[PDB]
Design a protein around this ligand. Structure first.
Ligand SMILES: *[C@@H]1O[C@H](CO)[C@@H](O[C@@H]2O[C@H](CO)[C@@H](O[C@@H]3O[C@H](CO)[C@@H](O)[C@H](O)[C@@H]3O)[C@H](O)[C@H]2NC(C)=O)[C@H](O[C@@H]2O[C@@H](C)[C@@H](O)[C@@H](O)[C@@H]2O)[C@H]1NC(C)=O
Ligand SMILES: *[C@@H]1O[C@H](CO)[C@@H](O[C@@H]2O[C@H](CO)[C@@H](O[C@@H]3O[C@H](CO)[C@@H](O)[C@H](O)[C@@H]3O)[C@H](O)[C@H]2NC(C)=O)[C@H](O)[C@H]1NC(C)=O
Ligand SMILES: *[C@@H]1O[C@H](CO)[C@@H](O[C@@H]2O[C@H](CO)[C@@H](O[C@@H]3O[C@H](CO)[C@@H](O)[C@H](O)[C@@H]3O)[C@H](O)[C@H]2NC(C)=O)[C@H](O)[C@H]1NC(C)=O
Ligand SMILES: [Cl-]
Ligand SMILES: [Cl-]
Ligand SMILES: [Cl-]
Ligand SMILES: [Cl-]
Ligand SMILES: [Cl-]
Ligand SMILES: [Cl-]
Ligand SMILES: [Cl-]
Lengths: 258, 124, 261
């Protein structure tokens, strides 16, 4: 038995093929039975059976290379990937997660757990660049797939690996989490442009956990305290209520029970 | 890479035709497909284009809502309706690669791959 | 492990961007609640505590409906001597504030400062749209849809056009009352002349604050006219017709939008 697999290729990618990809990812991350203030909640980690813990994302590119990312359904985030006969995993946060990832890619020959987790701070450190200076788009993703692939054969060094994780995590995990960020990647494909995410995108990414908490702990959608976000030009504004977020956020991490 | 046009022929004023443009091969780097037309002694005139990334259509000035350019699973079509004698011309399908930005190529010199053209003749 | 239920203190912003306001800052029982320009200070009469018991309180007293039939006024009242059912409210995700006992909704039937608030039969009109928040300004955004094109206002007409960040006519003010207003004329509103499919949407005066002027951004990317159930739709998926219509939900690309700010 294998976890559910969703496919995307950069070769000939269109606005439609990327949209279908992201929608299929969301459909396998959660059933949609738990919806709060019209925003779907991901499954609760506690008591989630191991056979339901992950989904796989097989990426292919024009160079006819493939890698398979593993995503944790409880937070939509990349935990590792497989290239050929090797698997690679971010440093687990705890003992239970360390056991959990042994259920991924079980027939792979070699397995490596990195010193670093997948948080942006460290990946930016390793890449030598902040998110605001790493271009996203179909071109960057095509290159990230090749980089991820050639890491297994010795052809990719760590800073390029880190940059490739940053590209994939935003174009897959953050796009699944946010219609807004899916729309941003849609735009890059639409106009065949690559560009770094503007401050509105970065701040949404940084705020996903706190937004999930604020919405689920709200009194009927009104927050106990504001969440500060940014416009595309970097100016700041505060959000006190779920209303404006309904078209912006597509998935939330499970914080508590209704 | 070869493009082939089909579907030209004879009709009378007010009639309709549907042209098709089939590539010999599918390349995945195409940015725009386009239809042009040419009569003797005039330059080639932009008729219609289709943006590959999302299917957005574009039309030349003299096709005044009368034509529809479209794409299918696996071929680009030009549906021509309410044809006037002024639409008689050789019609060509063309391909553009590597375009980047929010606009569209609409001039003959912006498309580098060309079919041989199919003749359209409108009676009366 | 149940979610915490806090009691936020917020303004309540509604019709034309005005705030729910205990008139003159006086708190004797029966004093009217009104629309008033949103303050920036800490005055109690515009700061509402959303209590766990479904009351809405200012300076410790309750937002209270005078009665259970359409058109009666809304007042401040001692929470324990008021009729309990008259102090109960639910705040809906679609912006409605409803009194469960009567099923009537908080309303401002005029748009002027000083308008006394009433309870009314729910018709999801702009006069019945509210937002609990301390944001006193509308959310200004572009609205992107089919083929990446931008919703654009041209006097009374609305259509989708190639996006340009230089174009004030492509900027939209998302008001607390559910209205979508062209940034260059905040007295105008995205308006459907009826609740019926294929009505061409226009830009008209916000004066009626009607059911045809209230819109909700849904989680699936559609922009929904609450009262009719119909969504904003690029007619025949053809931008060249320069017509946006109401149409039943199907979720194809000509019904999908995104607020890009
Ligand atoms: C991503 O790509 C993989 C590989 O192509 C997809 O899995 C494959 O799905 C096929 C069905 O779409 C399977 O083949 C068919 O089997 C049926 C049996 O009745 C036959 O009728 C039919 O003619 C085909 O032979 C194929 O076995 C399978 N390959 C695997 C699992 O390695 C994958 O599809 C997704 O996973 C499978 C397990 C099914 O649940 C699909 O419904 C599901 O969509 C692709 N992912 C997506 C999201 O499309
Ligand atoms: C929207 O703006 C209003 C006006 O500033 C904010 O109200 C203020 O909220 C703070 C903290 O929530 C209140 O302070 C608290 O006072 C209690 C009572 O002693 C104390 O126990 C707490 O530790 C804290 O100091 C403050 O009184 C209140 N101001 C008022 C009512 O005039 C409001 O928080 C904003 N709402 C949101 C969601 O941000
Ligand atoms: C505006 O928001 C309100 C509240 O979210 C919506 O009203 C609610 O809509 C749901 C779904 O239509 C109703 O669900 C029903 O629940 C009852 C009892 O739980 C059950 O008998 C049905 O099987 C159905 O599941 C819900 O009752 C209803 N009312 C409340 C108080 O939640 C309202 O529809 C929204 N208006 C628009 C135009 O979207
Ligand atoms: Cl390492
Ligand atoms: Cl940097
Ligand atoms: Cl133009
Ligand atoms: Cl011929
Ligand atoms: Cl008083
Ligand atoms: Cl009573
Ligand atoms: Cl006034």
């Amino acid at each position: 038995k294998q976890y559910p697999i969703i496919n995307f290729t950069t070769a000939g990618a269109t606005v439609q093929s990327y949209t279908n990809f992201i929608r299929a990812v969301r459909g396998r991350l959660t059933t949609g039975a738990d919806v709060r203030h019209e925003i779907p909640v991901l499954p609760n980690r506690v008591g989630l059976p191991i056979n339901q813990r992950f989904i796989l994302v097989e990426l292919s590119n024009h160079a006819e290379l493939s890698v398979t990312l593993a995503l944790d359904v409880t937070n939509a985030y990349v935990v590792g990937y497989r290239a050929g006969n090797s698997a690679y995993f971010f440093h687990p946060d705890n003992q239970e997660d360390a056991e959990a990832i042994t259920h991924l890619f079980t027939d792979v020959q070699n397995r490596y757990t990195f010193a670093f987790g997948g948080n942006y701070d460290r990946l930016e450190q390793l890449a030598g660049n902040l998110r605001e200076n790493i271009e996203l788009g179909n071109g960057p993703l095509e290159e990230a797939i090749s980089a991820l692939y050639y890491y297994s054969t010795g052809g990719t060094q760590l800073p390029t690996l880190a940059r490739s994780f940053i590209i994939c995590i935003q174009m897959i995990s953050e796009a699944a989490r946010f219609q807004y960020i899916e729309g941003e990647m849609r735009t890059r494909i639409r106009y065949n442009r690559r560009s770094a995410p503007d401050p509105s995108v970065i701040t949404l990414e940084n705020s996903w956990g706190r937004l999930s908490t604020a919405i689920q702990e709200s009194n009927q959608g009104a927050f106990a305290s504001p969440i500060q976000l940014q416009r595309r030009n970097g100016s700041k504004f505060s959000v006190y209520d779920v209303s404006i977020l309904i078209p912006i956020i597509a998935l939330m991490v499970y914080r508590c029970a209704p | 890479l070869q493009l082939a046009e089909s579907g030209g022929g004879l009709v009378q004023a007010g009639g309709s035709l549907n042209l098709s443009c089939i590539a010999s091969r599918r390349t995945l780097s195409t940015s725009f497909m386009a239809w042009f037309r040419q009569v003797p002694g005039k330059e080639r005139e932009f008729v219609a284009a289709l943006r590959s990334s999302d299917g957005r259509p574009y039309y030349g000035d003299s096709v005044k809502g009368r034509f529809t350019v479209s794409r299918d699973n696996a071929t680009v079509y030009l549906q021509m309706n309410s044809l006037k004698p002024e639409d008689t011309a050789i019609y060509y399908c063309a391909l553009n690669r590597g375009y980047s930005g929010t606009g569209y190529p609409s001039k003959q010199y912006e498309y580098n791959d060309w079919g041989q053209g199919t003749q359209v003749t409108v009676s009366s | 492990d149940v979610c915490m239920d806090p009691e936020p203190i917020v303004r309540i912003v509604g019709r034309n961007g005005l705030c729910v306001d205990v008139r003159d800052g006086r708190f004797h029982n029966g004093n009217a609640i009104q629309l008033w320009p949103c303050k920036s200070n800490t005055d109690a009469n515009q700061l509402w505590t959303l209590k766990r018991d479904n009351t809405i309180r200012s300076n410790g007293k309750c937002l209270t409906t005078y009665g259970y039939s359409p058109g009666v006024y809304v007042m401040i009242y001692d929470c324990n001597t008021a009729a309990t059912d008259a102090t109960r409210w639910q705040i809906w995700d679609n912006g409605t504030i409803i009194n469960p006992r009567s099923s009537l909704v908080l309303a401002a039937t005029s748009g002027n400062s000083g308008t006394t608030l009433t309870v009314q039969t729910n018709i999801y009109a702009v006069s019945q749209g509210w937002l609990p928040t301390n944001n006193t300004q509308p959310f200004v955004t572009t609205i992107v849809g089919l083929y990446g094109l931008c919703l654009q206002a041209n006097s009374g007409q609305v259509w989708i056009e190639d996006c340009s960040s230089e174009k004030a006519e492509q900027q939209w003010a998302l008001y607390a009352d559910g209205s979508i207003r062209p940034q260059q004329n905040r007295d105008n509103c995205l308006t459907s002349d009826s609740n019926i499919r294929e009505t061409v949407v226009k830009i008209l005066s916000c004066g009626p604050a009607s059911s045809g002027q209230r819109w909700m951004f849904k989680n699936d990317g559609t922009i929904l006219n609450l009262y009719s159930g119909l969504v904003l739709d690029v007619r025949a998926s053809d931008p060249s017709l320069k017509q946006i219509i109401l149409y039943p939900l199907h979720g194809d690309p000509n019904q999908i939008w995104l607020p890009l700010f």
